A paper describes a structure:
In the [name] complex with phosphite, the phosphorus centre of the ligand and the four tetrahedral atoms surrounding it (3 oxygen and 1 hydrogen) occupy approximately the same positions as the equivalent atoms in the hypophosphite complex (2 oxygen and 2 hydrogen). The two common oxygen atom positions between the phosphite and hypophosphite make equivalent interactions with residues in the binding pocket, namely the sidechain and mainchain amide of T129, S130, the sidechain hydroxyl of Y97 and the structural water molecule (HOH). The pocket is capped by a tryptophan sidechain (W52) that makes a P-H…π interaction with the R1 hydrogen atom of the phosphite (distance of 2.7 Å and angle of approximately 140°), forming a similar interaction to that present in the hypophosphite complex. However, the additional oxygen atom of the phosphite, to which it is equivalent, points towards the D206/R178 salt bridge to one side of the [name] binding pocket. This phosphite-oxygen atom is 2.8 Å away from the oxygen atom of D206 and 3.2 Å away from the nitrogen atom of R178, suggesting that both residues interact with this phosphite-oxygen, albeit with a rather long hydrogen bond to the arginine. Although we could not directly observed the position of the hydrogen atoms in the structure, at pH 5 it is likely that the majority of the phosphite in solution is mono-anionic (pKa 1.3, 6.7), carrying a single proton on one of the three oxygen atoms. The 2.8 Å distance between the phosphite-oxygen and D206 implies, therefore, that the phosphite is protonated at this position and acts as a hydrogen bond donor to D206. These additional hydrogen bonds appear to provide enough stabilising energy to trap a fully closed complex in the crystal structure, which is virtually identical to the conformation observed in the complex with hypophosphite (RMSD Cα: 0.25 Å). We have shown that [name] is capable of binding phosphite at pH 5 due to a change in the protonation state of the ligand that facilitates the formation of extra hydrogen bonds within the binding pocket of the protein, enabling the formation of a closed complex. Although this complex can be captured by crystallisation with a large excess of phosphite (5 mM), the Kd of [name] for phosphite at pH 5 is only 1.74 mM, which is ca. 1000 × less than hypophosphite at the same pH.
[name] WM88 has PtxABC, HtxBCDE and PhnCDE ABC-transporters for the acquisition of phosphite, hypophosphite and organophosphonates, respectively. These transport systems rely on a high-affinity periplasmic binding protein (PBP) to impart ligand specificity. [name] is a typical type-II PBP, with a binding pocket positioned in a deep groove between two domains separated by a hinge region. A comparison of the [name] and PtxB structures showed that sequence differences within the binding pocket essentially eliminate an oxygen binding site in [name], providing specificity for a ligand with two oxygen atoms (hypophosphite), over one with three (phosphite).
Author numbering: 7 to 63, 64C, 65 to 157, 158C, 159 to 242, 242A, 242B, 243 to 262
């Protein structure tokens, strides 16, 4: 009678090893509160963690917003809580450019430039920038010299080294890379920033044990900002109780894109 939990976390940092090193402590804390043993993985892409949850491989997953919406539609995955960054359950999508890129008439002056978006399960990296371009009648695949599937770490590296012109990122991710000395911010600039988006979703499978679900929610949402920050990467400092309707803006964007 030894309780065991399978954990997964999305690409919070540029590599899976950095993500696990910095964020495992919150999962270890959660398991210890329950007297559970555990295992943990961090897939390379935002799509991959959504798929792992949908296919029955994960008990408690830290999914991105679009990854949660997709898994809920396909398998009935439930959101229990939303992560806080700087005390708020929100964040912004970015399009970043080379520092010397002419942008005074953006994006009408950008035809044929090299643009890299992320995997199709990535909210800020793919869904939101695609929705932006469609809202102004631009098809990125024909308008730009276009690539899809890159990680946020790859986008920022390639911009800094002059291999692409433009790439997607999220504000909380870019901040962490600057803070860790992984980006020289003098070599890039923010070209576009979205409106506020709901943050990542702490998620469980459909019909996960009801008693355990309630306990998990209480353990995470009762944490002080100081204690939460001591267990996670810089800026991540708590959890708030959440439900499906908190993700409406993401569901709406997905539906409009088809
Ligand atoms: Mg507590």
């Amino acid at each position: 009678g030894k309780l065991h939990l399978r954990f997964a976390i999305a690409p919070m940092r540029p590599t899976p090893s950095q993500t696990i090193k910095e964020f495992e402590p919150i999962f270890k804390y959660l398991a210890d509160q329950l007297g559970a043993t555990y295992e943990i993985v961090s897939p390379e892409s935002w799509a991959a963690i959504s798929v792992a949850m949908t296919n029955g491989h994960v008990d408690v997953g830290w999914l991105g917003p679009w990854g949660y919406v997709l898994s809920n539609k396909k398998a009935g995955t439930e959101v229990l809580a939303t992560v806080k960054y700087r005390g708020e359950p929100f964040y912004k999508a970015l399009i970043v450019g080379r520092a010397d890129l002419p942008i005074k008439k953006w994006p009408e002056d950008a035809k044929g430039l090299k643009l890299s978006l992320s995997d199709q399960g990535n909210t800020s990296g793919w869904l939101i920038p695609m929705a932006y371009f469609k809202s102004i009648g631009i098809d990125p695949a024909s308008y730009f010299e276009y690539r899809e599937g890159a990680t946020f770490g790859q986008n920022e590296s390639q911009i800094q080294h002059g291999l692409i012109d433009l790439g997607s990122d999220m504000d909380r991710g870019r901040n962490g890379m600057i803070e860790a000395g992984q980006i020289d911010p003098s070599k890039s600039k923010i070209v576009w920033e979205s409106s506020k988006l709901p943050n990542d979703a702490i998620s469980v499978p459909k019909d996960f044990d009801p008693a355990l679900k309630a306990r998990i929610t209480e353990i995470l949402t009762s944490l002080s900002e100081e204690k939460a920050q001591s267990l996670m990467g810089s800026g991540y400092n708590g959890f708030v109780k959440a439900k499906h309707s908190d993700y409406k803006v993401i569901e709406d964007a997905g539906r409009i894109l088809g």
